[PDB]
Amino acid sequence: RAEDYEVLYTIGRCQKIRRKSDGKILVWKELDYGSMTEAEKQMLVSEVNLLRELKHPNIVRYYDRIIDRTNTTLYIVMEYCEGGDLASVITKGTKERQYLDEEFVLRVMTQLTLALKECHRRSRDLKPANVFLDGKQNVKLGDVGTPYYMSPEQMNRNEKSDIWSLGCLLYELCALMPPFTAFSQKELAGKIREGKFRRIPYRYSDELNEIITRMLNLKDYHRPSVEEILENPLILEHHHHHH
Numbered sequence: 001r002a003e004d005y006e007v008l009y010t011i012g013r014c015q016k017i018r019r020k021s022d023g024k025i026l027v028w029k030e031l032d033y034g035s036m037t038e039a040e041k042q043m044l045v046s047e048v049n050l051l052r053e054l055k056h057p058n059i060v061r062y063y064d065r066i067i068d069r070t071n072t073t074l075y076i077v078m079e080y081c082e083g084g085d086l087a088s089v090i091t092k093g094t095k096e097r098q099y100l101d102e103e104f105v106l107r108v109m110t111q112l113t114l115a116l117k118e119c120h121r122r123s124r125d126l127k128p129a130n131v132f133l134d135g136k137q138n139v140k141l142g143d144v145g146t147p148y149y150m151s152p153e154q155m156n157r158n159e160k161s162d163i164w165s166l167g168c169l170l171y172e173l174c175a176l177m178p179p180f181t182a183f184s185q186k187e188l189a190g191k192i193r194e195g196k197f198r199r200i201p202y203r204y205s206d207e208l209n210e211i212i213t214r215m216l217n218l219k220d221y222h223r224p225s226v227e228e229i230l231e232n233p234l235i236l237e238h239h240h241h242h243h
């Protein structure tokens with residue numbers, strides 16, 4: 001029950017909470033369902049049950065669901081990721097004019113690729129705002145604007161589409177900007193179809209630039225598979241998750 005936890009403070013509604021029994025630090029996401037139709041609530045139950053299923057080191061862990069029919073509020077209790085989201089890291093870098101270490105980029109590439117491999121197996125938008133960092137250098141995938149990560153196929157007509165999006169995310173991690181920018185989606189679609197972009201900064205190795213470039217190939221069948229990505233000599237044991 002909700003009484004089993006103590007709210008410490010609001011993060012984003014998302015809140016940092018402390019479990020009373022053992023003092024474990026978690027977060028929960030608030031969801032007022034008071035205004036939902038029966039149909040929309042059924043979908044919510046099926047989705048929440050979906051989330052309890054997937055267990056993986058590189059996917060935000062969902063522990064519990066708490067119903068409070070009083071305020072008609074649903075609480076999804078989950079792992080706390082002290083490093084926050086990847087979008088903020090990029091913003092911080094953009095402002096402070098400071099590029100991220102290649103080591104960090106390799107970690108994100110390795111651990112998100114493992115998250116994707118798992119998602120594909122059980123068959124999650126892959127943007128920086130949906131990628132979280134914990135306290136031990138681990139990277140976790142969680143669950144109107146310009147569609148920077150839209151793939152060529154998605155613009156018309158596929159796991160290789162996920163590879164493209166990962167390519168976009170990693171590219172932005174390095175350059176601190178997306179590979180294709182524009183003011184309107186039509187202009188954007190134009191640039192994507194051309195498939196051209198700047199090389200990531202020179203502080204980054206040719207090998208790293210090479211694989212990000214491959215993920216951004218116009219032909220889905222030229223993009224590396226999850227398996228081919230992980231075979232890359234760049235990727236080592238220490239880049240993986242550690243408890």
Ligand SMILES: Nc1ncc(-c2sccc2C2CC2)nc1[C@H]1CC[C@@H](C(=O)O)CC1
Binds near residue numbers: 060078082142143
């Ligand atoms: N489980 C989470 N832990 C931490 C955080 C954030 S995000 C930016 C600030 C921080 C912290 C350190 C002060 N966010 C989450 C989540 C929120 C939403 C969620 C989902 O859509 O399921 C992913 C995890």
Ligand SMILES: [Cl-]
Binds near residue numbers: 175198199200201
């Ligand atoms: Cl550059």
Ligand SMILES: [Cl-]
Binds near residue numbers: 138241243
């Ligand atoms: Cl882990």
